[PDB]
Amino acid sequence: ISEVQLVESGGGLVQPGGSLRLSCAASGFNVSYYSIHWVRQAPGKGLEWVASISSSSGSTSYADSVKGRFTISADTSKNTAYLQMNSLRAEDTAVYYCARSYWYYIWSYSYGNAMDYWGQGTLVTVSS
Amino acid sequence: MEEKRLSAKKGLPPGTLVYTGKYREDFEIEVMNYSIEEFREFKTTDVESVLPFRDSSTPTWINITGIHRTDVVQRVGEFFGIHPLVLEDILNVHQRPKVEFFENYVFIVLKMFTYDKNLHELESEQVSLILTKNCVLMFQEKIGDVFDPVRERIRYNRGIIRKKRADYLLYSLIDALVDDYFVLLEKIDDEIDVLEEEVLERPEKETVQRTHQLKRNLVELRKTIWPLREVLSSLYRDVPPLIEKETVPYFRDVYDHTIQIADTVETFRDIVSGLLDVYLSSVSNKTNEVMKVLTIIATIFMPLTFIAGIYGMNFEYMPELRWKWGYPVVLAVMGVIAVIMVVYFKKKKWL
């Protein structure tokens, strides 16, 4: 039914040290069977990975630069993932992309995932 | 033996089922619910349109082309009561054919082969069947199968398939697979005919590479066909309550067919080995001819150079003043020994 779509909302202006949560609404698929990723890109900078969540197992993984501050979660009933940001520094002013990835097989020991669908990006800016 | 559990993997969350393949271009679901009177067929993409047909009065055939979407596989398995390890086996592709008998279903893993006349590659598609009480669940990797005759029989009321239950549907699917294997062996016959007509008069290293490739294909076919014999044997000799006491002779017939296929594969491997031996013999014969030419020229001429050296030194005391100048006698001796050597070579039939 319908087409796959990742929708992100709730990102906006925030004072430094101010906590705001980002929600990644998902359509066209169940969040339980897939892994939802968050990707951050500062203005005029390359893509950087920030966090990950495995809804069907509750397994989480964060990047070193943001580990300990950002917390990721995804409730199956609402079919939406959340990335809670706190102590948001000035260097984190960027646009946040939420994606969906599938696992593929290379060898028995090796696995890698690639992101099919991205959202549009919430411009989380930090000022004053 | 031990209890069945979802095997753990490293660098992978416990609850994730991974498609162990490379086909990610297509997805559709075929459903063919047929009674003895009427039948309805359709193609969809929503998973939930096929779940109602689990508790079907009449046999129904669900063909979920494309397992790269693991979500539909997991949902179907959850609704149909399929064990998670069985779903893991469905999505796993790098494995051999098998059946595991459970309380409510039988889970058959099978292989499909297609031969390409360009560069002679053999490609394997894994197809898996699940025979529940009133339905047959079939999973495929990509579009393009061999069960078209079974579909034609279902739609056109040819045979007894409409008057039988899902066990006959399973038998018909396996029979179509075996027919596909027979056609594949015919294609290998054509390839071996081409290889025979090429090797005899045009021997080279590309022929060696093609022969080794064909031998590898034969090895793969044997390795995948022997478990087919095992699985058909286990089907008709360890019949579960799901398979009726009838239609067992059909399984026996398919078992005889797979015995024939295995024997044909062995003969094919022997024939390609014979072709390789013929090529080796031909190149050895060419080496023989080259050796013969070299040894003949050496045998004829090296004595001549040696005797020219013996009479070509300078000692200032030799019997070099002989009748008929001696030197003509030396040349006569050399000619005599040369023609003697040539006569010996002719007697031994070289050149």
Add this chain to the structure above:
Amino acid sequence: LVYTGKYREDFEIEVMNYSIEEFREFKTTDVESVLPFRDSSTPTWINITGIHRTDVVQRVGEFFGIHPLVLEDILNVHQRPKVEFFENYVFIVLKMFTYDKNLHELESEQVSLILTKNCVLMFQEKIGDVFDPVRERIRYNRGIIRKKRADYLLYSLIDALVDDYFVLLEKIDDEIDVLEEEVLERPEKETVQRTHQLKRNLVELRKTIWPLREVLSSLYRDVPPLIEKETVPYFRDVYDHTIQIADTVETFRDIVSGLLDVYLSSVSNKTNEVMKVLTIIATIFMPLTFIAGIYGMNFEYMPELRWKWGYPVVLAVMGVIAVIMVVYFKKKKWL
């Protein structure tokens, strides 16, 4: 309806009726009129040669009520032999083969027969079959064939065919013996393709014989619908003959597989012998040439002189080095 047969040179009909007291032979040049028309009173045998005239097949199918499917299956040459059973008639398909001493290639064409109560029908493609002894013993009234029934005639037909298979097998055996002698004694370039071609012929013969054994196994012990129970031992005899034929073909494939390798082994040891000769001559003569070059150097301060017949000394040293080389090779057992 459609056939791949390439033989259309001649067409003829062989029709004859033989009874206990008197026998008739007509061999009409065309269909004319089948005298029996399901008379079921005397033992009859009708044979037609040629398949291009498809009107004959359609006419006999219309008269005898033959199934369209089997009639279509008659006009097939690439189809393996098989058997089918029906109430009124039995559908039996076999094949012909012929081997010569020049072409070294088998000629393949198919002959099939249909059995009916007191009526034997079959379709022939090429003239010159192996049925001459059967025809002669029918004409001369010897044995017990000219007694009664029609299944005995069917057994006679199958027996003549398996006898032709046996004589073809004997010719194959003679060819294998000749080719084995050629490989063992005088290997050459053409022998390898001769061996490969003979192996191909044996593979084809096996792939043809095995369905024949299956068919003859299906004929016996299956309680055929309309066949006298007194003709079972003859079917048993032809079944045993077919089993022996299959075993002989398997042994033939094995012996040819061995023949290719013995040829290769002889080739390799031929290379070894050639190299033996070359190494012997080179080793014996190269140092002697080197010595001769040494004792012919243009150096003016040359130590050699009339050193008590130095030339015989040089001849003696070359002789002794040659003899030690040849005895070294004798110890090495190369020559």
Add this chain to the structure above:
Amino acid sequence: LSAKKGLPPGTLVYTGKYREDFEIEVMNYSIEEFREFKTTDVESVLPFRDSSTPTWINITGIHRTDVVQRVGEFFGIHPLVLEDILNVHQRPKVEFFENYVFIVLKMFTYDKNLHELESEQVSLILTKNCVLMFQEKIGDVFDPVRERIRYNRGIIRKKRADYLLYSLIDALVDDYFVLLEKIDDEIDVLEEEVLERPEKETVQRTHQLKRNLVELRKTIWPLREVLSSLYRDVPPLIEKETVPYFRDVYDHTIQIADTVETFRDIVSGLLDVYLSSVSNKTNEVMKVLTIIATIFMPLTFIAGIYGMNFEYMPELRWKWGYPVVLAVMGVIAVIMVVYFKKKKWL
């Protein structure tokens, strides 16, 4: 040459390579009474079919069709199996009948000195209590059965003619054991020969051994067929008590087949062994040629160089002259020798 050509199927013609002798000897035995006498008269021992005690009838050297025809007619035997018994180029085959059972059996003989295989067919016919066997020649493997019946050893004398048929078949199977042991001896000898000291005749010996093995397999597999038929289905004339002995002979036959297959595989590998050995010998001879040539081509080259006929050279004196070339060539030869020693080509 196994073809009857255009002959009636009921022909009683005989096809045998040997026609020298025609003799008959019979022995009738009971629980406590035994008889043994040899007579060449057919009617002397013919009227024994109406007897209640088992009898053993032997008609060897059947090159005369009249005697076999008379035996078949008196016993009410079909002429088809008369053709079968009077033919020698037939596989061992079994067929049942309402009042008798027909058995085709093969007897072998191996000549070690010249390495050929001899095949001879012995057909056994059992009817009521009458046991008939016909051989091409004189001298049979059923001699142990003769000493068993004559010396009153074992339980053969107590049982019926079915046990006699079992005993004869068992004796033939034991002969197959001993001849197959001889075959194993030949295989061991040939593998040792083809490994250690390959030669021209090893390849023909391998071909001949493969021929003998394939002929032996062609004979043995129908023996499996006939024993399986006698085991799985019991004829009414064969006693139910003696089924386990037929099962034992069936196991013997399958063992013979297994070891025959093993022998075939070994003989198949022998030719690869020969090719490996001859390749090693070729490598050795080429090493020798390479050593000699590499040593002596440069030396004769230099000898020619310092022996040319130009007008001007350092011929008069060059580092004391003549010994210099000999020394440098010796140095070159020793350098080549030590190089080859380092490459262990010597």
Add this chain to the structure above:
Amino acid sequence: MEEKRLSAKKGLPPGTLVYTGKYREDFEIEVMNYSIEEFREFKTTDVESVLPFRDSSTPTWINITGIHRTDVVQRVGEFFGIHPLVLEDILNVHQRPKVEFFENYVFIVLKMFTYDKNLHELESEQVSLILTKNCVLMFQEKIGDVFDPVRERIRYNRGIIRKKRADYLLYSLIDALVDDYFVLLEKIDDEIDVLEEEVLERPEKETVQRTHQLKRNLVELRKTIWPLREVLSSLYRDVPPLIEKETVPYFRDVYDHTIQIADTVETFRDIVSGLLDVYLSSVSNKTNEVMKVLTIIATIFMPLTFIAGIYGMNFEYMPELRWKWGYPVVLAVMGVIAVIMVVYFKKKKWL
């Protein structure tokens, strides 16, 4: 003649108890009458004190080691009611593996395999099992088996061996035998790998000698393995009255183990068949290298000796009178030819 005597007991009546092997040094009789809470071991030497254990209402494992002594085997067979043919099968070492379902007992023939890592060789010791009512007999040739795990299970109640009947004991013995077959398969794999390495790297005469030895060992092992599958299939499929229906899935598991054994043995057979072709190719590569050396030397020194000869004949009209530095220029020409030949061989990459 060795100890493979197939001509043994040829002129002998049936049921004659004649040992046809080699092991006569050792002898041992064991008893293990375990129960649902208690167990007893009575390891004696005389057979006169083991007979009354058949009538006991508890499972017992009577092991007799050493079948050379015909007296003990004959006495046990006579007292238990065992047909003399079964006894002579027990003594006959060369017996093919088989299972026979007599009315009162189940008689099983097997083989126990021993391998030596240091010496390229292989042995085979026969073992026979007779399951009659609530007991499991046993006869083996020499001291040393693989059934130590079963003995340990009996001694200390590790598993369920003490809560089951005799047929479960038969199962445990079969499974231990199959596990030993696994471990010896691993050993054979080790020697196959070392042979592949040696053939690839260092070809000699001993390599092909022990390769032939290995091929013989594998063909013998496969010939022994194949009847094992049939024996186990007979064990679980056509259930006899002497086997509890609860034991059948266990025998099915062991049958699958035998399936795996057979497939691995076939793989080993294929590898060993390819081994000698690999050997031929390697030795041909070595002779290719030595001939490359020979060809290089001949190429560098044949034209030079030719042109050394061409200057040096007794011609008076040759411009050898130092026309333009004749000796040094001809030496320079020779050096140039040698250098260009070396460059050509480097281009062809023969060094």
Add this chain to the structure above:
Amino acid sequence: LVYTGKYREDFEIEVMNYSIEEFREFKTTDVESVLPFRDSSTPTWINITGIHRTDVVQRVGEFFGIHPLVLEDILNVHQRPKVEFFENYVFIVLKMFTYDKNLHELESEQVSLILTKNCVLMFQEKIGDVFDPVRERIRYNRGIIRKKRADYLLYSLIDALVDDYFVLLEKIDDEIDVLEEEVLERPEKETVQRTHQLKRNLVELRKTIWPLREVLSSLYRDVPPLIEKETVPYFRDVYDHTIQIADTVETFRDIVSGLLDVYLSSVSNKTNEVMKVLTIIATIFMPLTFIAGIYGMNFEYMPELRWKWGYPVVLAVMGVIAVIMVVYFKKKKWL
């Protein structure tokens, strides 16, 4: 008791006693430090890197109540990974690997683990292990390692060793990709040696990885009193990881064997080429130098005067014969 291998003797002892509340660690070099650590309920990890010096391991052997046979096994480094269960402890043999990319060398190092109640023994032979993540986990309470007993420590060590095998497989995957690229296109004399080295390394890998799987299987399948049932699922996970490693090793070995085969084929073509070169060079030159030798003889009668300048005629006939054999070798498609 002697040390079989060859590594340097550096006797160093590490002690790590930890509990749920807090841990205690000290690094010493005296044997007596580890004797009194058999009583604490808090799990204690004992390291002895220098197993070469048999004195410390012997003191351990008699103080820890273990048979000298396991001491001999501990000193024996050429041992496959096997596990032994005893009435009071468990002895586990493992292997640690280190693949140098530069030399393409696959080195091995045997480390043995002994698990007594409330303590774990561990014997290296060289400085440096891979159990540092376990050390960090124990130090910083990163997991539940301090909430569990010594069986969890044994599990953690085995799991870290399995992760080391995974990293090894990653390195070898990179090497196999590179070597496959080099072998398939642009061959060279060094790629074959690299492929042989890779094959030997993979053989060592499989020979050391199959017993590891067997050890894990025999570890979780049966539960001795020393090990609790809590760690059985953890050892099941480790067994699954070893299954992954075995499958990857098998696939890699298949790939490498394919690369070996593709080079192994087509040697007879090289033999034919070297034959062509040698025969062509040696055939157009031996007659030429033969003629040169004939005219280089020392007989006095030979006509060497004028005759159109003399040597031009022999040069002309020599070039004629040379081009004759050149044209002949142009036939048969040699040149």
Add this chain to the structure above:
Amino acid sequence: DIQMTQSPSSLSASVGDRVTITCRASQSVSSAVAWYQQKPGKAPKLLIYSASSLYSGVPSRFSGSRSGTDFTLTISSLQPEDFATYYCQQSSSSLITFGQGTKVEIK
């Protein structure tokens, strides 16, 4: 962690030419490398996954390769809509990282 170095950081080429972008890994990634493209103002789009396999729904002109720890994205022929920024990404570990990017403009 694991790092990618994507060079060049800015490329200029004309339509119809051949573009080769290569990024190297600091350590082992077993072919678990994927390529992306992002036109400014829009989310990235997947092009190549598993370092060789072309995605479903992308033009066949794009290609990917692997050589040890070297991964190359090659375009057979540029198009007017192919002028964007290309990225690398490894996923061998649980912590996935991106390359710094490679822009393409006309020349």
